[PDB]
């Protein structure tokens, strides 16, 4: 029924690849909208992630209230970053 195998159509050129890390998974699965939020941070040397799975709520827009974001991991690499793209997974027709 459900294996969730994925195909990497994101890159082609595995060249000069420097650092590897394996982490624990970030998302887990709850009837309403569990908002999942992340903060990508650019500090000199280190890049911190600040995450929350909210509890279940029904706001079509942004909800109100306060959410405290916790530091998970900083990443000691230290490069310039000017842009961003995300990545999605879909069985899309041709």
């Amino acid at each position, epitope marked *: 029924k459900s294996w969730m*195998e994925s*195909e990497f*159509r994101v890159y082609s050129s595995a060249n000069n690849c420097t650092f590897e890390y394996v982490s624990q998974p970030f998302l887990m699965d709850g009837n309403f909208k569990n908002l999942r939020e992340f903060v990508f941070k650019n500090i000199d040397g280190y890049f911190k992630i600040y995450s929350k799975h909210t509890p279940i709520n029904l706001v079509r827009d942004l909800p109100q209230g306060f959410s405290a974001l916790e530091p998970l991991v900083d990443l000691p690499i230290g490069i310039n970053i000017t842009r961003f793209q995300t990545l999605l997974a879909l*069985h899309r*027709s*041709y």
Partner: antibody
Amino acid sequence: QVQLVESGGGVVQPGRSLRLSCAASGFTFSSYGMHWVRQAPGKGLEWVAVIWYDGSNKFYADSVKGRFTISRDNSKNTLYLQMTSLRAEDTAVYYCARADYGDFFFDYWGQGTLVTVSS
Amino acid sequence: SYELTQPPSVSVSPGQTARITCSGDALSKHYGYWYQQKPGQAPVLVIFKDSERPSGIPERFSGSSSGTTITLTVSGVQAEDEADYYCQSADSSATYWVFGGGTKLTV
């Protein structure tokens, strides 16, 4: 029933160019991807080429990569081929198979266009 | 990609038609299709999604496709059965279509 008019067939010298056209009729041309299946007689069928409904990407059979550009245009309502520098593998019957995403079936098969070389 | 593990010839004449059986590991990923090769050289779709028949089909049973193989839509022996069958499966996502070589059904 709607139908496909595939053409361009005939004989050619090996290793030089030949175009294989396939007019579409009766349906909308701007919603369906078209395939091409080559089959030398005496053996089995083999898909060779496909593009999108608008031709956004050009995806081919893996043996015959890079030699052939295929193109559509929605005003002319045809898809044609071009056979640059074959190695006498195109002694084959070439079909137009309509494909409409029922997880990639082949709806309306063509009549079959022959290319065979005189070597 | 891999060619579909097919029969090349099922020469068959009891009243029951014996089981044409084509298989493969990408058939586990996405369900496989079947196409004939009729004399007159018009291939037709005979079973799609292994449950439901096309419009204008010769009226038969359907596919079942139990596991890694496909058991298909054949009935008892008629006069149109000598047109053979061809396997068809798409791959996972890299848009490839494989065939095997075709069967052969013979009374």
